[PDB]
Design a binder for this molecule. Structure first.
Ligand SMILES: O=S(=O)(Nc1ncc[nH]1)c1cccs1
Length: 162
């Protein structure tokens, strides 16, 4: 069913996350963590205090798909995730580490979200946006509901953290 999923997304905020490679999304799925650059880290920390749920929707650059979505369970904290960093991306260049609970680990191709435009990015298709781009509530909710159901996930424990 979709009822607990809809409850988790109620009055949520949504942010597009762009990962340079698949390895870091795989690590995030395995370890329940994410890190971003300080400009986006500040935005997510503000949002985490401000909303019942902050949802990160992940897309690997050039993949043509989203790889799933997750809910922040903490603000960022410091003090060492073995991110696969491209040349020019330093471990210190990143911010802290956010803990996340995956809501859906399944893929969604961009072809299936072509009817969804993001008011906060000039009504461009929701697939379009820089890392950290906020997605307006209605568009973000509909995008999350397009993903295939992930039957491996039990949202009972996530609801209790709200
Ligand atoms: O360098 S990434 O593969 N992608 C990225 N987007 C914006 C800054 N970095 C990475 C993902 C997670 C830790 S490091």
């Amino acid at each position: 069913g979709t009822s607990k999923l809809k409850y988790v997304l109620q009055d949520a905020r949504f942010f597009l996350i762009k990962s340079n490679n698949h390895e870091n999304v795989s690590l995030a799925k395995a370890k329940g963590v994410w890190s971003t650059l300080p400009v986006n880290e500040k935005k997510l920390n503000l949002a985490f205090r401000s909303a019942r749920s902050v949802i990160l929707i992940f897309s690997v650059r050039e993949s043509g798909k989203f790889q799933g979505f997750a809910r922040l369970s903490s603000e960022s904290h410091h003090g060492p995730i073995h991110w696969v960093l491209p040349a020019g991306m330093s471990a210190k260049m990143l911010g802290g580490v956010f803990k996340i609970d995956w809501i859906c680990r399944r893929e969604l191709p961009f072809t299936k979200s072509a009817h969804l435009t993001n008011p906060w990015n000039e009504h461009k298709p929701v697939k379009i946006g820089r890392d950290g781009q906020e997605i307006e509530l209605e568009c973000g909710t509909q995008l999350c509901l397009l993903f295939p159901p992930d039957e491996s996930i039990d949202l009972y424990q996530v609801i209790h953290k709200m």
